[PDB]
Amino acid sequence: AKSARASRIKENHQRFKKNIAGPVEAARLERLSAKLMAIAQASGVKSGKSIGRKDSSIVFPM
Amino acid sequence: AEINVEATSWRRVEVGRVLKLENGSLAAIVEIIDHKRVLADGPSSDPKLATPRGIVPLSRALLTPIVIPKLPRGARTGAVKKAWEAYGVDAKWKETNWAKKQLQQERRQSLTDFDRFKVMRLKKQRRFEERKALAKIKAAA
Amino acid sequence: PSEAGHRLYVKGRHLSYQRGRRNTHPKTSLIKIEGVDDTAAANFYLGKRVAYVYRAQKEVRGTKIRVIWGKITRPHGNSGVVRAKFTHPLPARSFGASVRIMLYPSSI
Amino acid sequence: MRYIHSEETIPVPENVKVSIKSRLVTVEGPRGKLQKDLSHIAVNFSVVKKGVIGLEIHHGSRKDVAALRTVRTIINNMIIGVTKGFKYKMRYVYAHFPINVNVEKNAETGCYEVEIRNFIGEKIVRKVVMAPGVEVEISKAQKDELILSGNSLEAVSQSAADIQQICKVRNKDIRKFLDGIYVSEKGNIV
Amino acid sequence: LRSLTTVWAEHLSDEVKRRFYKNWYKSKKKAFTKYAKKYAENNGASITRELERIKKYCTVVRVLAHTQIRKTPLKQKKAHLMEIQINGGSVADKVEFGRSLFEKPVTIDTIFEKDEMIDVIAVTKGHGFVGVTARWGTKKLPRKTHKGLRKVACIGAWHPSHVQWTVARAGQMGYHHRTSVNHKIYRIGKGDDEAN
Amino acid sequence: AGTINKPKKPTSKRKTTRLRAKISKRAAEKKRKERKLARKNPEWRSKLKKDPGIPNLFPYKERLLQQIEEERIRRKEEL
Amino acid sequence: SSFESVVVIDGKGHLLGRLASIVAKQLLSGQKIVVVRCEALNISGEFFRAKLKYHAYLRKMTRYNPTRGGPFHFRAPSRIFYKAVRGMIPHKTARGAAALERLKVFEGVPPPYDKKKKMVVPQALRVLRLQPGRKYCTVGRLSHEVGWKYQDVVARLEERRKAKGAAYYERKKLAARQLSEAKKAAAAKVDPKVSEALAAYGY
Amino acid sequence: MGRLQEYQVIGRHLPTEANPNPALYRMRIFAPNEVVAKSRFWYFLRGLKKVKKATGEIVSVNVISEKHPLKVKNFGIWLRYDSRSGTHNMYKEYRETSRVAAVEAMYADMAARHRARFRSIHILKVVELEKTEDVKRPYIKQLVAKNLSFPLPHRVPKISTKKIFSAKRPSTFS
RNA sequence: CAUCGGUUCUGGCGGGGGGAUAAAGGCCCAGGGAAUGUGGCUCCUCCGGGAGUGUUAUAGCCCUGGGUGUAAUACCCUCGC
RNA sequence: AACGCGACGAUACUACCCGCACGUUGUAGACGUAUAAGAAUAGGCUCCGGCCUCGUAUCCUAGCAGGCGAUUCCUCCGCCGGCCUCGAAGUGGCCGUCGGUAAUUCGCGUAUUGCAAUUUAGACACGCGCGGGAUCAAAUCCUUUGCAGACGACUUAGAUGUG
């Protein structure tokens, strides 16, 4: 028997993933993302656009 | 047929090539013994640049830009000296940047405490002038 | 005002005692002087006094800083390391600590 | 023994441009550009003469002296590639099941792809991707022949070898089962 | 991977605030009360700055989400909180998506679909302290074996002069973390459907 | 072999005192036994060993042969 | 010799054991050492020999319990260099532990060492030590092949650091050009006796 | 093997009533000093003429200096050396400025290439090759070529071993 | 710290002797010789350089004897500071 | 990793933060504890003129351990603030105010620590003080639960409630 780690089995599974399961999973992902997107859509320093600083050591103390 | 080759251009050990030894003296290759040793003679009238005729290991020598033209292989000290003064090896060595670096090294090594103090003060005066010039340049652009 | 330092000594490091493979002899220490890398350079510092300066807990006679004094005795090896003899042997914990090599007694 | 000096030479044709910088060799011809990094070999390059490249080794052993012959032939092959090209003809033969070979060009990658079907009646589709720069065509002059052409001899011959190795008979007597795809001719395009 | 910053929503429910407490009934319930003021101060400048930091520096974005445990028949009132990764899109898309999902309920059918195979992660049933026969499936020793039969006869017969880590020993069984894969979803039933 | 990915047990180059002493003893015994066999050797040995001669690549071999001729002629004349 | 507060060493192109020996001696003498770019260290000989040695190392583990006492096989390149250094230090003594606390090793160049001077050790440099034609490998490649997970992250971070270094180098070249122009313009305004005395002293 | 000198050693058998004037024997010995030179002389004489040290005397020991130590020469050395197989003839060539330098280079060469130590080597002839056409070995023939000139690629610069750290990566081009 | 004594490590300087009264070497004198043959000359060329001829010419080298010369220096031994 | 790390919430006090006021407080060891290209090494650098063995370099370096007053100079340094900028273990640039400041020259002071004795001088951390600014928290026992359990431990609940 060819093992689950066999190269031929991996190549067979890659062809299956690319040609058969892939489009089905992509279409399901499109539907789910559309539903959750519908749910979701239902001075620099003083404004925070400029990212200023928030309000054991890598070096020797010197 | 267009050929563009960009590679190294080493200086070559050859008869007539002037070597600088580790003590600062100069010699000229008279005969190549093997890939590691040469026979060399420095007939310079300057005692600092002079070298007795003898075997020089190339690991202890550096190749200068100067090559004495048409120096015969195996030439004795008289002919080597005649070619040396005819070509003017000492003057060209003085114009090389290696000898200027060596001269600067000896000038800095011969400084006394008063000399170092005066060096610092004169350098500060010159540095004040260069700082004004740099401020003017940076103000322009 | 002045922006210069005040150092009149040469920096050194206390490396080890005089030792073989296994046996050590604390009566003589080995010192690496800064910038001294040969026996000829080490010959300048022979007889120079060397201080190991350290800190204690209790303040005794105005200070917490204690000193062990010694002298440079002879060169060691070929790389400018010197042997030094102190009044008391230096602490074994101070392997890698700093010492001050004075410019006295001077012969210049 | 260490030899003081050893040298090889490469002639360059009139329509070729050779640029060497830090042992990275670029060869220019009518058919395109080839590049090859030769910095794993100690060699000094020079222009000895108009239209001649010089290769030299200083103070080298016999092995280092011998390596210059490989360097010479490699650069000569790049020159031949940009001038005349390289062409490998392969023939596929069968006994009972006709081998079907289909050739496509991937627009995304730019590489050619060869699909082989019905190899001794097998149902799997064998797919070989050609090296970039190798063109594959089904011949019209001869029966059951593929033609792989390009500038890089290594790319062409390795593509041909990949096609040769993908159609391997297994667990059968090879005195009897003669199906396969074999390199039948090697040469130049021009 | 390193967590650079987190941004919280303006309003958090009591069921998720209970997760930050051991003695919520005695508490002053002060958690996030100073944090909620950053939405009002300077028109939310600190919130905006942390969102921009996530947009420009981060590669992985995860939402924080909690259960509504009060809609279950469980006596527990303290909700479960977890990080759920947003996959797909650019980092700016992930950040805008999560900020749009702030304070909102996400139903199970917007994440999973019927006929999908999923993975289930949980801690298994606890069994307490268990001998080797039920813990490891070893063969029982014969009847009235001296010093017990629900044991392993020789835990060591050979060198080293140690018990090895690969020998079966009595100890805790169950309450282990397990990830089980490839579980098919047969139905996603809706709670408002009287015929689900 | 798969030596690089899965190397086997190393062969130690650290000797033991027992093996060192045993090897030294066997070497000394072999030296004694070889001396005894050389003393009782029945194989014929030449009184004078065969000389290799002069190497051909020596550039003055012909001159050395001339000197040998001259020396033997002078010896014959003196005797 | 020279005593420094801390010596930062660029680990690129250095031979592992020779650098480790020099670093261990400096640590025991009392000098603080930071080594960066440990993924760019070199090991002489072919890569498969280094791989064989690391797999032979991976063979060894405490038989009765691999969680205690066993040789813990660290796969990061800085940890490979750290193991090489620790083998040349009496680490089971207090002095050896104190010497090991004076060392830091990193993959890549994390800040603030990106803006610090990085030194080289010529007695351990591969271009100066190895005979031409001899094979050598990279510790980073060895680490990646035995299970270090962060080769690509370090490579991207090094790429951003080198782009910022390119910008800094453009500014540095502009500053050097302006300094040369300033000295040339100021040479007219310095007193000629001052200039001649400085030249005679060698400045 | 060592800083060698060439010695002329002349010795003889002690005179007797039958032989009032014994023959004198001269050898050229390469040796570090005079004690070693006389010991080697008696060793070879015992091997050749069966004259022992106790029954003989040393007549003269002199140093033979090189006539032209500043002239590059090619040397042919004929030697015999002892190995596990036996005694082997060997002809080798050296490009030196003196016979003693050639013999030292021979000793180092025999040690490096055949592990032949000092007492297993018998030097039979050291000749200065008069003409360029007398050179037989290619490793000397490539050195005596017309207009010989070579570069020195990949020269490691000399840095003091006491300077541990450098602020600049060195170059190997000079 | 200065002046001493004992032991010892280390640096520098001035002399004397030996050997082939070092061997070399420089500058002269008188012979002899060749090539990895200089100049010249001849023939080919990619005009860059090659091949040939022959003994100093528009470079030089090797060997022998002699003078300066009891030259210098190395090495070894040695008297001191 | 129970002596590896990160983000976040609330943090009562003698807790937190700011200022200066110092330590018979500590630290494998301050004393100018100054200095970022990358890359190749059978090749590189550049201001495009040239340059490359070499850090034997460059910067800085004078004054009571560095005073006071002038002459003189617009150079260098520092604290703050604004705008940007820096996520590999996050900090630099510009501008502005303020303060200091021999590049030149001079005046008054230095003694007596007695012929040397660490040159008590730095950084980080910790602590005791005041004078201010800011903040009013949790955990455990206990009772309870059984998704747990030998005992500890764990999941829960206990403050008005969908208890």
Side-chain angles (χ1 to χ4, degrees), chain A, chain B, chain C, chain D, chain E, chain F residues 1-44 46 51-73, chain G, chain H residues 1-16 18-49 51-174:
Chain A
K2 297 248 68 171
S3 76
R5 290 187 295 277
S7 291
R8 214 177 65 210
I9 302 302
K10 288 174 184 168
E11 277 143 32
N12 285 344
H13 288 342
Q14 285 157 2
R15 263 138 40 198
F16 191 94
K17 287 174 187 185
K18 194 223 170 181
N19 303 327
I20 305 180
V24 178
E25 274 173 50
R28 170 190 297 144
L29 184 54
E30 283 313 352
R31 298 191 294 267
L32 285 161
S33 182
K35 288 166 73 153
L36 184 71
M37 188 51 81
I39 270 172
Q41 300 282 78
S43 169
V45 166
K46 303 184 175 182
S47 63
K49 281 342 208 154
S50 207
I51 312 184
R53 299 248 169 161
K54 282 191 280 192
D55 314 305
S56 60
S57 199
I58 202 182
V59 295
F60 288 107
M62 97 189 145
Chain B
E2 176 196 12
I3 309 173
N4 331 112
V5 172
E6 202 29 44
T8 66
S9 60
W10 306 280
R11 291 168 192 167
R12 279 167 149 257
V13 353
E14 40 155 337
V15 180
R17 170 78 65 176
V18 176
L19 317 182
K20 172 194 176 297
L21 307 186
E22 274 155 17
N23 73 26
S25 65
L26 300 177
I29 299 174
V30 181
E31 189 138 1
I32 301 171
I33 307 171
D34 41 77
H35 65 294
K36 284 167 159 295
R37 299 170 301 160
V38 302
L39 178 64
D41 200 324
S44 167
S45 47
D46 193 344
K48 275 142 136 293
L49 305 179
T51 307
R53 172 173 283 246
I55 303 175
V56 168
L58 289 166
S59 64
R60 298 305 173 260
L62 290 173
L63 306 191
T64 69
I66 314 172
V67 178
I68 302 176
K70 311 209 143 308
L71 188 62
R73 175 187 52 89
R76 302 171 75 96
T77 310
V80 170
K81 188 158 94 84
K82 177 184 174 183
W84 186 285
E85 328 274 29
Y87 198 50
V89 184
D90 287 3
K92 307 187 177 188
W93 169 248
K94 191 143 126 62
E95 322 322 343
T96 50
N97 288 344
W98 281 1
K100 297 171 181 176
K101 170 67 178 185
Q102 183 187 142
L103 182 61
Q104 165 180 299
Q105 283 175 342
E106 319 158 334
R107 280 168 173 172
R108 295 189 184 187
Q109 275 161 35
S110 61
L111 295 179
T112 71
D113 204 48
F114 194 29
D115 283 354
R116 293 187 229 101
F117 182 80
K118 280 143 78 182
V119 157
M120 161 201 79
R121 287 208 58 193
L122 295 171
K123 278 201 306 178
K124 286 176 79 165
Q125 299 170 354
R126 182 180 69 186
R127 169 229 271 175
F128 175 69
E129 280 311 311
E130 322 184 287
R131 280 174 172 183
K132 288 156 63 184
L134 187 58
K136 176 190 208 23
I137 287 178
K138 286 188 176 179
Chain C
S2 325
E3 304 272 62
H6 307 92
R7 185 169 55 88
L8 300 164
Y9 62 92
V10 188
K11 307 177 182 180
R13 283 172 175 175
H14 176 212
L15 311 169
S16 174
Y17 298 143
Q18 176 182 33
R19 63 177 300 168
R21 250 287 278 130
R22 301 151 176 96
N23 305 332
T24 70
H25 313 279
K27 67 192 171 187
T28 306
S29 285
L30 305 176
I31 310 298
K32 177 63 181 185
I33 312 174
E34 201 171 32
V36 179
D37 305 291
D38 51 270
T39 305
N43 278 333
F44 172 85
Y45 296 89
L46 297 192
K48 292 294 188 296
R49 305 228 275 274
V50 45
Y52 173 55
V53 171
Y54 64 98
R55 274 175 323 211
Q57 270 111 303
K58 211 177 46 137
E59 211 208 286
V60 174
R61 305 208 162 183
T63 183
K64 304 150 118 61
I65 289 171
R66 321 269 190 263
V67 183
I68 307 178
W69 279 104
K71 68 191 82 33
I72 292 176
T73 62
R74 55 186 280 181
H76 186 79
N78 293 323
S79 308
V81 181
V82 292
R83 308 191 193 178
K85 267 190 172 303
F86 292 78
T87 286
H88 300 150
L90 291 188
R93 200 191 197 272
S94 68
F95 292 153
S98 64
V99 288
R100 307 189 172 198
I101 295 98
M102 321 308 298
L103 297 185
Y104 52 84
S106 175
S107 58
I108 325 169
Chain D
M1 206 197 129
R2 304 201 73 87
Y3 305 94
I4 293 288
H5 180 263
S6 293
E7 189 188 352
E8 306 278 349
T9 51
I10 302 168
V12 180
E14 214 35 65
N15 38 8
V16 189
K17 162 191 174 179
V18 185
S19 144
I20 305 180
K21 199 204 175 253
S22 37
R23 286 163 289 179
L24 176 56
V25 185
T26 295
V27 182
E28 291 318 0
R31 314 190 88 263
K33 172 156 126 190
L34 288 170
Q35 280 223 129
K36 203 140 194 169
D37 176 25
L38 298 178
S39 62
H40 49 93
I41 297 170
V43 59
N44 191 39
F45 284 110
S46 70
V47 184
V48 15
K49 196 194 308 179
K50 177 39 199 43
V52 177
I53 300 174
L55 304 73
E56 61 190 5
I57 177 75
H58 307 288
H59 316 291
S61 58
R62 202 180 180 89
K63 205 216 259 162
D64 312 318
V65 171
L68 299 200
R69 306 211 149 187
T70 305
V71 183
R72 179 280 299 270
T73 300
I74 280 170
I75 298 182
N76 187 42
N77 284 348
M78 320 174 45
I79 286 164
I80 290 168
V82 307
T83 42
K84 309 169 184 177
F86 291 107
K87 182 177 63 177
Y88 273 46
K89 299 181 185 177
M90 288 175 72
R91 285 178 57 198
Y92 50 97
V93 289
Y94 46 85
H96 182 273
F97 297 103
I99 298 171
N100 173 268
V101 181
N102 184 258
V103 174
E104 44 280 341
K105 187 176 180 60
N106 196 326
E108 315 161 354
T109 75
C111 293
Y112 276 75
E113 291 169 341
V114 178
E115 288 180 352
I116 306 159
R117 289 175 168 87
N118 205 38
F119 175 66
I120 326 188
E122 281 194 1
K123 298 307 184 183
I124 195 177
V125 178
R126 295 162 158 87
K127 195 173 184 177
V128 195
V129 175
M130 294 303 108
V134 176
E135 177 217 352
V136 180
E137 48 192 354
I138 304 180
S139 170
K140 316 270 154 263
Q142 301 294 335
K143 168 193 178 181
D144 294 343
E145 174 172 307
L146 299 147
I147 299 168
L148 292 81
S149 55
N151 293 343
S152 178
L153 167 66
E154 298 208 8
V156 167
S157 60
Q158 188 60 63
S159 294
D162 299 333
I163 299 173
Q164 207 144 202
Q165 284 200 338
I166 204 93
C167 294
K168 174 196 175 185
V169 190
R170 284 185 47 181
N171 307 324
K172 301 288 178 177
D173 199 341
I174 54 92
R175 310 169 295 170
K176 180 81 172 188
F177 292 85
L178 311 181
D179 303 26
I181 317 187
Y182 315 90
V183 167
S184 58
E185 184 174 340
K186 302 165 296 184
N188 291 324
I189 305 166
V190 179
Chain E
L1 283 175
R2 188 175 80 87
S3 179
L4 191 61
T5 186
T6 69
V7 183
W8 297 86
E10 188 176 0
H11 312 93
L12 311 181
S13 171
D14 278 354
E15 54 188 350
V16 70
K17 282 185 175 181
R18 278 173 173 266
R19 183 51 62 179
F20 314 116
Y21 285 98
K22 303 271 145 102
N23 301 296
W24 166 268
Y25 79 111
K26 284 186 311 175
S27 167
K28 291 323 225 283
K29 308 166 181 184
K30 301 293 296 299
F32 290 86
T33 48
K34 315 287 187 62
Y35 186 89
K37 291 187 225 284
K38 309 147 78 75
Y39 275 82
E41 291 148 344
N42 313 61
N43 267 309
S46 63
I47 305 306
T48 302
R49 186 179 74 231
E50 294 315 304
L51 288 170
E52 293 297 324
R53 189 188 316 277
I54 302 183
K55 285 190 189 180
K56 97 151 301 179
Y57 289 127
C58 295
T59 59
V60 167
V61 185
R62 308 178 183 167
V63 294
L64 284 152
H66 69 88
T67 53
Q68 304 196 64
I69 205 169
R70 54 178 227 289
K71 298 177 178 302
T72 72
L74 306 186
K75 275 123 199 151
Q76 178 175 343
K77 312 169 181 181
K78 153 165 43 189
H80 288 106
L81 173 70
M82 86 172 283
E83 291 180 7
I84 303 175
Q85 186 157 313
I86 313 167
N87 273 0
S90 73
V91 176
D93 301 343
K94 296 163 188 286
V95 172
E96 285 302 315
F97 193 58
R99 193 225 83 270
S100 304
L101 281 175
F102 266 17
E103 296 182 11
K104 289 187 176 175
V106 171
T107 59
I108 187 66
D109 61 317
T110 61
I111 304 178
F112 300 108
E113 176 183 304
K114 173 192 170 292
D115 306 332
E116 191 174 3
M117 245 165 207
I118 65 170
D119 308 336
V120 176
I121 302 166
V123 179
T124 56
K125 190 211 280 185
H127 301 95
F129 202 94
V130 168
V132 294
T133 302
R135 201 189 191 208
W136 297 95
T138 61
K139 174 77 58 190
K140 300 174 62 188
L141 302 185
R143 176 199 59 88
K144 209 55 188 187
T145 297
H146 179 59
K147 253 95 73 163
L149 49 92
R150 299 184 64 83
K151 279 174 165 184
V152 166
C154 321
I155 61 168
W158 318 102
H159 280 103
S161 293
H162 284 289
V163 179
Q164 279 164 70
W165 62 290
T166 61
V167 176
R169 307 288 262 160
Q172 167 72 36
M173 188 185 139
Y175 207 73
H176 306 313
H177 184 278
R178 289 294 182 266
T179 302
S180 60
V181 302
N182 299 348
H183 292 292
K184 185 84 158 187
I185 292 179
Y186 272 13
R187 175 168 289 200
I188 301 187
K190 288 311 253 173
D192 66 82
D193 186 16
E194 294 313 286
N196 56 11
Chain F
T3 307
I4 304 169
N5 282 351
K6 213 167 185 171
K8 299 184 167 195
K9 180 181 190 170
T11 307
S12 185
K13 306 271 305 295
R14 177 194 297 192
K15 287 129 153 154
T16 61
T17 306
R18 219 177 27 240
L19 191 53
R20 292 202 314 264
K22 206 155 192 172
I23 288 171
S24 297
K25 220 166 300 294
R26 291 281 173 41
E29 289 254 35
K30 182 180 180 182
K31 262 186 46 56
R32 255 118 57 182
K33 190 175 180 178
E34 256 167 356
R35 235 147 48 191
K36 173 181 300 182
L37 291 191
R39 242 176 64 250
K40 265 31 70 178
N41 187 224
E43 180 177 45
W44 279 350
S46 58
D51 197 281
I54 313 164
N56 294 330
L57 275 176
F58 185 60
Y60 309 134
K61 176 170 177 180
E62 187 146 35
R63 260 145 60 168
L64 186 49
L65 294 179
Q66 269 129 36
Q67 141 176 342
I68 287 168
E69 286 307 52
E70 168 191 6
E71 203 307 312
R72 84 182 28 176
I73 287 324
Chain G
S1 35
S2 178
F3 303 155
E4 319 282 335
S5 60
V6 53
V7 180
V8 182
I9 302 172
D10 195 311
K12 173 187 169 62
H14 284 87
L15 297 165
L16 184 78
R18 292 177 184 267
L19 184 56
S21 178
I22 279 148
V23 159
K25 194 52 190 177
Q26 293 283 323
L27 294 167
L28 282 157
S29 304
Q31 172 71 58
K32 289 185 181 70
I33 304 288
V34 173
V35 183
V36 296
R37 300 167 86 190
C38 287
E39 74 280 355
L41 289 159
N42 291 132
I43 301 174
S44 66
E46 295 236 50
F47 174 69
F48 67 79
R49 287 187 63 81
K51 191 170 177 57
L52 194 154
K53 287 185 184 182
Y54 203 88
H55 279 283
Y57 173 52
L58 276 173
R59 293 180 36 97
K60 313 179 187 298
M61 188 75 81
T62 291
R63 173 72 261 171
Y64 60 90
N65 200 354
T67 65
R68 65 173 288 185
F72 300 123
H73 317 278
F74 283 77
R75 292 109 205 277
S78 64
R79 277 303 116 170
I80 296 178
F81 178 68
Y82 187 83
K83 173 180 178 295
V85 170
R86 198 193 84 167
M88 324 174 158
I89 278 172
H91 67 104
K92 286 182 177 177
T93 63
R95 184 178 75 110
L100 278 170
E101 296 337 307
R102 309 188 184 104
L103 177 69
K104 295 184 189 302
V105 287
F106 305 98
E107 281 95 45
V109 194
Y113 301 108
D114 56 341
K115 302 213 203 30
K116 281 178 169 359
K117 188 71 178 69
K118 288 160 275 289
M119 308 288 280
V120 292
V121 190
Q123 293 171 44
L125 274 178
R126 186 242 312 153
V127 287
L128 309 182
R129 291 294 313 183
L130 250 58
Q131 191 177 15
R134 296 304 179 189
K135 305 299 183 184
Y136 63 96
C137 60
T138 306
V139 178
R141 178 187 176 188
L142 173 63
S143 290
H144 182 74
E145 289 220 12
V146 303
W148 177 46
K149 305 177 177 178
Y150 309 110
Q151 175 180 88
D152 293 1
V153 171
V154 168
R156 297 190 227 99
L157 290 172
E158 281 293 290
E159 283 340 295
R160 326 217 317 121
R161 164 191 159 265
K162 285 172 187 174
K164 293 196 273 195
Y168 153 76
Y169 182 61
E170 271 325 287
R171 300 196 306 270
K172 190 180 183 184
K173 286 216 308 274
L174 169 65
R177 186 169 344 111
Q178 285 176 334
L179 181 58
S180 302
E181 262 134 29
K183 297 192 171 185
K184 176 142 199 73
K189 299 213 217 272
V190 198
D191 186 34
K193 287 71 38 193
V194 174
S195 266
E196 271 137 35
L198 281 177
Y201 287 133
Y203 295 81
Chain H
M1 317 258 156
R3 186 42 20 71
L4 300 173
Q5 294 229 253
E6 198 176 15
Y7 298 89
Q8 167 191 257
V9 186
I10 299 172
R12 73 169 180 179
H13 187 278
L14 284 172
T16 56
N19 200 353
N21 217 55
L24 305 167
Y25 295 112
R26 170 184 175 273
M27 317 182 86
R28 304 170 69 113
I29 312 289
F30 293 95
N33 56 77
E34 267 204 8
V35 185
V36 184
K38 286 182 295 174
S39 173
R40 294 304 282 173
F41 176 81
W42 284 122
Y43 175 83
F44 293 136
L45 250 200
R46 179 161 47 260
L48 292 155
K49 293 290 185 178
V51 178
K52 290 168 298 306
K53 180 185 176 179
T55 74
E57 96 191 283
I58 297 296
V59 181
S60 190
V61 173
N62 303 79
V63 168
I64 316 174
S65 294
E66 191 75 14
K67 287 187 174 180
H68 302 278
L70 297 164
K71 191 232 301 180
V72 183
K73 297 168 284 287
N74 305 309
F75 289 94
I77 294 185
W78 169 28
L79 62 104
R80 289 184 175 170
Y81 86 105
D82 284 309
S83 73
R84 43 192 254 280
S85 172
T87 307
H88 323 282
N89 254 335
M90 263 170 114
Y91 173 69
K92 281 177 149 293
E93 291 179 349
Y94 301 92
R95 187 161 161 91
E96 300 281 348
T97 58
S98 62
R99 297 166 51 86
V100 282
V103 164
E104 302 198 11
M106 191 267 326
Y107 275 127
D109 192 29
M110 282 321 284
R113 297 194 136 104
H114 299 281
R115 266 76 206 195
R117 284 153 191 41
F118 178 83
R119 64 296 308 151
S120 68
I121 297 170
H122 284 165
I123 311 173
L124 266 41
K125 232 166 207 294
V126 174
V127 294
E128 178 182 343
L129 302 176
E130 313 137 5
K131 308 174 181 178
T132 309
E133 59 185 273
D134 296 349
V135 171
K136 308 303 176 187
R137 299 300 177 191
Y139 51 84
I140 310 289
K141 288 247 66 182
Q142 68 171 358
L143 291 174
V144 298
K146 185 186 173 184
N147 295 129
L148 182 71
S149 166
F150 48 85
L152 297 173
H154 199 86
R155 291 192 80 195
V156 179
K158 293 281 159 13
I159 310 167
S160 60
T161 64
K162 308 300 155 54
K163 190 188 181 186
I164 303 303
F165 304 110
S166 173
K168 185 214 253 173
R169 303 194 88 103
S171 298
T172 61
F173 315 112
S174 50

